Amino acid sequence: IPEGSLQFLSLRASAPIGSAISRNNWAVTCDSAQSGNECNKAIDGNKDTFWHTFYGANGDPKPPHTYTIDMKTTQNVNGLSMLPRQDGNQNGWIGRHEVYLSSDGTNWGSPVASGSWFADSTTKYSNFETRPARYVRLVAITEANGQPWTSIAEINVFQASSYTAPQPGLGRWGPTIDLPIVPAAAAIEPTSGRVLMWSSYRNDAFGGSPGGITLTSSWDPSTGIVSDRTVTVTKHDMFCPGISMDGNGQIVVTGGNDAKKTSLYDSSSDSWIPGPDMQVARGYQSSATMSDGRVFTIGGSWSGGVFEKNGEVYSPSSKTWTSLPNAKVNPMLTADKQGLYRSDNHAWLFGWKKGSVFQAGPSTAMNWYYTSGSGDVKSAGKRQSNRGVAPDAMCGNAVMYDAVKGKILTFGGSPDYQDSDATTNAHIITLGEPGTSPNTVFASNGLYFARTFHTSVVLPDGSTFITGGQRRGIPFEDSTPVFTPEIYVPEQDTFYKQNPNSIVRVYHSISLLLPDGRVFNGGGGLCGDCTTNHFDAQIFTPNYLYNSNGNLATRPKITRTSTQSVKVGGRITISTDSSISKASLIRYGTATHTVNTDQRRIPLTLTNNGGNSYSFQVPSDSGVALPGYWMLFVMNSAGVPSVASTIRVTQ
Ligand SMILES: [Ca+2]
Ligand SMILES: [Ca+2]
């Protein structure tokens, strides 16, 4: 008996890592309950009985509706589950919701989790960081269909095996954002400032695949609202696509199950529209935006035949894909045990000067790709250090934290895509002109924790946040998880462990830098009726946003910008509320399968005009300052960043 049905495009939701707390001694209360649908009906163990708020003769009071639990004793709570009514009737199904924890039952504080649950009969979960509590409260903000009622067939609360208070100075995890989909792919859509999330659909528990369906949702940081899941017949089964945000700011998704399809996200109408078909079938490949705004892609797993997966280029202006057969994929293949099926997967691509694209790995061999004529490829040497040659690092990460100096930090990964041990390998690559072999050195003493399928983002201050993953790569399995994130600080050539989280983020997980300076980490799974589909995300707040007291630090503010669009080499003048010491530009990102070829950081050279007025010039080379949308951050002497000001860079 699987969860849900094909009719609803259902998937089993992942539970927290813990056990259900005995409810025999619980005292429950609700804002209202119809006779016959008492509040204790949600804790009687009968899936066919449910609590239901007032209706009919008692009137139809609208939400919010609340369910409060007194567990009588303190427990280390890390989640809750909600089983909706199972009679086919949808009245009362909870949509938008919030979860609160309390030690006294009177001070509930702020929600430990909030978001929106999908409208179907499957068991829903709200998983969050462990916290001692005697009382738990679930608030239904809206009903799945906008109706006045709230109902619950069974509600449970989970306890972790232990609790350890977070250490001061190492950041903080929370809250959890509950979603109606597994965010397997995501991006920060620049025109709206929202986190766009999407996934494909498949569930062998039902069989008979629908075909070409894309499920999408979004989270707005300014309102905290998670939009309802949308089902689009894109005729593009993604699952393992390439993703880029072009020079104009449009999200371009390529290949996957439907190997030659291209889908574009039209931001003005919040919808996926068809793009031109690629010339070659590809899956698990990376794509990268170029200095001229075009998008380059190479690799594509294996296909029944003898068609090579050499490079090709997309033009947003002519809406065409053109093969670049001489931009050969062979030089970048790893020695994966599975051969061509995996050897060209997830290349560490970076658009660079004069239409070139640098490939930093995962293969030991690094290469330069060219896009003039029918393409070209030139060796850039091997990723290495005084410690030796770096081994193939499939699903390791690569982040360009200082584009002006050509700095790329690489870390983690394993020799084979699956069933192999990850390593602590980490390197710093310093890019020069196309065609030259960059110098490479080891980053500090490597990662604290070996990991693969982990994700990462460059932060406003130039540091790189690294999170999730597992010690041994096993897609869809939440084994050997790494719960402690790490931050690399370049000026100190040092890695720092941060406070750990409670949710496993492995294969199919993502991370993105939010405009407000925090990190959005979520997803993982997408395996039908499996127990590892994570329908959520969590926020990580870096230490730079907290003062010594534990409260939010005062942030510098950008009170004015002379323009919001500038050509490469151009100048922008700004005004701040107080003196600042540094500034940076971070390109908006996209993410899936550990790949993010869109993010990068440019340290800005400031000019002090006095009176808290500063100006800066955007790098003249579009290979460094890739066209598209960027986030402008200013930092004070204490290292605290402002929230981002959106800037569009053009040619
Ligand atoms: Ca019941
Ligand atoms: Ca929009």
Side-chain angles (χ1 to χ4, degrees), residues 2-651:
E3 282 292 85
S5 63
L6 186 61
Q7 182 184 303
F8 286 73
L9 298 180
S10 304
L11 295 171
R12 178 180 296 280
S14 181
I17 301 177
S19 57
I21 296 167
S22 182
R23 310 174 298 180
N24 67 307
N25 299 304
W26 287 9
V28 298
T29 54
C30 61
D31 61 305
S32 82
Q34 193 87 337
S35 181
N37 301 106
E38 291 63 37
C39 180
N40 51 50
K41 294 292 185 178
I43 62 167
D44 61 5
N46 196 315
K47 301 179 180 179
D48 297 309
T49 62
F50 53 86
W51 156 58
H52 195 299
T53 54
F54 278 172
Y55 74 84
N58 296 305
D60 299 291
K62 298 187 172 190
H65 290 304
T66 306
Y67 197 96
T68 305
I69 302 164
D70 176 359
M71 305 186 291
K72 302 303 178 181
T73 178
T74 303
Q75 305 279 49
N76 296 318
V77 183
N78 70 345
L80 74 70
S81 67
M82 187 290 299
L83 177 70
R85 59 190 296 169
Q86 304 286 296
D87 60 355
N89 191 299
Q90 298 175 21
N91 292 353
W93 279 4
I94 298 170
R96 294 187 58 190
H97 61 279
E98 306 179 320
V99 178
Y100 299 78
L101 300 182
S102 177
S103 61
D104 48 38
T106 55
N107 167 23
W108 298 94
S110 58
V112 293
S114 69
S116 299
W117 284 321
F118 174 56
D120 78 358
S121 64
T122 66
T123 299
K124 304 305 189 305
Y125 300 86
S126 185
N127 307 323
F128 44 78
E129 292 305 290
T130 310
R131 192 167 88 200
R134 168 178 162 175
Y135 306 77
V136 180
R137 171 175 286 175
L138 174 62
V139 182
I141 299 299
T142 67
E143 190 245 26
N145 295 146
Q147 296 289 59
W149 328 284
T150 292
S151 61
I152 301 177
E154 287 294 304
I155 186 170
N156 283 281
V157 178
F158 298 74
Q159 63 186 306
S161 61
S162 65
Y163 168 70
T164 303
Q167 297 184 60
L170 302 187
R172 291 290 187 293
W173 280 101
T176 291
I177 303 298
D178 295 337
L179 308 162
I181 64 171
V182 173
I188 302 300
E189 201 285 296
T191 66
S192 70
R194 300 174 182 170
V195 180
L196 183 66
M197 298 162 277
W198 68 98
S199 76
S200 187
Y201 183 73
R202 184 190 306 179
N203 195 329
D204 298 302
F206 304 141
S209 176
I213 300 299
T214 299
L215 304 176
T216 310
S217 184
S218 70
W219 177 67
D220 192 325
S222 68
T223 64
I225 302 175
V226 171
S227 60
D228 280 33
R229 182 188 86 172
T230 61
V231 180
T232 305
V233 181
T234 56
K235 297 182 180 179
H236 186 177
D237 269 293
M238 300 167 182
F239 288 112
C240 55
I243 308 175
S244 284
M245 194 170 281
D246 69 23
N248 302 311
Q250 179 162 66
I251 298 168
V252 183
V253 184
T254 51
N257 185 295
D258 283 307
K260 288 185 180 181
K261 306 299 293 184
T262 299
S263 295
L264 312 174
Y265 192 73
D266 184 86
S267 64
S268 78
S269 67
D270 295 350
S271 64
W272 292 105
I273 59 175
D277 271 29
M278 289 190 291
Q279 299 295 159
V280 183
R282 307 172 191 278
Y284 297 94
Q285 84 288 357
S286 291
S287 64
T289 299
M290 301 154 54
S291 62
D292 59 8
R294 293 191 295 174
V295 176
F296 175 80
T297 190
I298 191 164
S301 193
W302 186 64
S303 300
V306 295
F307 296 143
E308 295 193 304
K309 309 304 179 184
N310 300 131
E312 67 177 290
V313 60
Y314 166 71
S315 166
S317 58
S318 61
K319 287 300 180 63
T320 62
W321 277 100
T322 305
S323 182
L324 296 176
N326 290 327
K328 303 298 184 184
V329 66
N330 283 359
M332 64 161 267
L333 304 177
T334 68
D336 202 292
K337 298 179 178 180
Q338 296 191 71
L340 295 178
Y341 178 65
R342 297 298 194 182
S343 63
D344 66 6
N345 296 10
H346 315 305
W348 303 350
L349 306 180
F350 298 91
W352 200 233
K353 305 182 181 182
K354 300 183 179 181
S356 69
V357 176
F358 186 68
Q359 175 262 327
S363 62
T364 296
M366 304 184 291
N367 297 275
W368 284 106
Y369 279 103
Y370 302 87
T371 57
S372 56
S374 296
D376 200 5
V377 58
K378 293 184 180 180
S379 175
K382 299 180 180 181
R383 188 172 59 261
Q384 64 189 308
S385 75
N386 48 39
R387 298 195 177 196
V389 178
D392 291 328
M394 183 55 58
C395 289
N397 292 14
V399 180
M400 182 173 283
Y401 66 88
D402 185 335
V404 175
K405 293 188 176 183
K407 302 288 178 178
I408 300 170
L409 171 70
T410 65
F411 44 93
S414 56
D416 296 307
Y417 200 108
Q418 59 181 56
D419 300 300
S420 67
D421 303 315
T423 82
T424 56
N425 267 280
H427 296 79
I428 301 296
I429 303 170
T430 301
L431 291 190
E433 297 304 88
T436 63
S437 294
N439 169 287
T440 62
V441 298
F442 211 71
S444 194
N445 183 224
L447 299 172
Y448 272 95
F449 305 103
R451 59 183 89 207
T452 189
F453 296 145
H454 52 298
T455 56
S456 55
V457 300
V458 56
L459 305 177
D461 58 11
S463 65
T464 296
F465 177 75
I466 305 166
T467 195
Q470 58 191 345
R471 303 175 181 178
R472 192 165 193 290
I474 309 296
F476 305 123
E477 194 176 78
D478 287 3
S479 49
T480 66
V482 180
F483 294 113
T484 298
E486 301 179 49
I487 290 180
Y488 179 72
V489 180
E491 183 61 59
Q492 299 168 41
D493 186 26
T494 300
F495 284 94
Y496 285 94
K497 290 183 290 181
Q498 308 300 120
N499 280 313
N501 82 311
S502 65
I503 304 175
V504 180
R505 299 295 184 197
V506 292
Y507 187 72
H508 245 165
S509 65
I510 63 88
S511 277
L512 292 168
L513 173 67
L514 296 170
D516 60 47
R518 298 175 301 169
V519 183
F520 186 93
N521 174 51
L526 202 65
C527 38
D529 201 54
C530 65
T531 63
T532 55
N533 296 314
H534 295 87
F535 281 76
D536 61 25
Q538 291 184 107
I539 302 300
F540 175 78
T541 301
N543 178 62
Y544 56 57
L545 292 183
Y546 293 114
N547 55 46
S548 62
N549 294 176
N551 296 307
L552 292 178
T554 303
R555 309 177 68 163
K557 301 177 182 58
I558 299 177
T559 59
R560 175 211 164 187
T561 58
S562 58
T563 182
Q564 294 78 197
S565 184
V566 62
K567 299 180 180 180
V568 289
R571 181 175 294 291
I572 294 180
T573 301
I574 69 178
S575 286
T576 58
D577 73 314
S578 55
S579 67
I580 55 174
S581 60
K582 296 180 178 180
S584 66
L585 283 176
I586 299 184
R587 197 165 181 279
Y588 277 76
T590 64
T592 196
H593 291 68
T594 77
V595 183
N596 185 337
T597 59
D598 287 297
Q599 78 181 331
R600 61 171 58 190
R601 166 176 169 280
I602 287 175
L604 296 170
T605 300
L606 297 168
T607 289
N608 198 318
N609 305 306
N612 295 313
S613 177
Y614 306 80
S615 76
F616 61 81
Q617 171 182 49
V618 175
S620 61
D621 198 311
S622 63
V624 174
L626 286 184
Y629 284 89
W630 296 66
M631 290 176 269
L632 167 65
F633 288 101
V634 294
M635 280 67 61
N636 59 28
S637 60
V640 186
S642 62
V643 290
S645 281
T646 303
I647 303 296
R648 179 176 180 178
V649 173
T650 65
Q651 298 177 60

